[PDB]
Amino acid sequence: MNTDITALEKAQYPVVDRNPAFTKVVGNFSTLDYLRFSTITGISVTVGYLSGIKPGIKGPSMVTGGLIGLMGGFMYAYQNSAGRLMGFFPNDGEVASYQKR
């Protein structure tokens, strides 16, 4: 399979890594990424609990909401971290860490 990461709209910030590996993107998670992750997961668990009370399955509903929130929050944090490493999002921290290591 031939691949090509090249985007239609070029990055407006310095490109620290054109096609960062999965584990590199995850290790690039910042405090703000974890805050987004945790907030999305917590809101999802809360919605699961509250919507589960009337059917009587608040626990399992919490688990289902938490799974949805975990997947969505991880995808959002990955999106942000990868976009920063690729230069699509403001990436002052990535540039600073890159100019030193």
Binding site: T31, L32, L35, R36, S38, T39, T41, G42, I43, V45, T46, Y49, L50, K58, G59, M62, G66
Partner: peptide, 29 residues
Amino acid sequence: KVSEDKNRNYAVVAGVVAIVGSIGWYLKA
């Protein structure tokens, strides 16, 4: 003395985490 409903306690923790994480998200952005 103690709240015994474990699922309710977990939901309380989740709501608190959502609130505090939202505050931090606003503050650090």
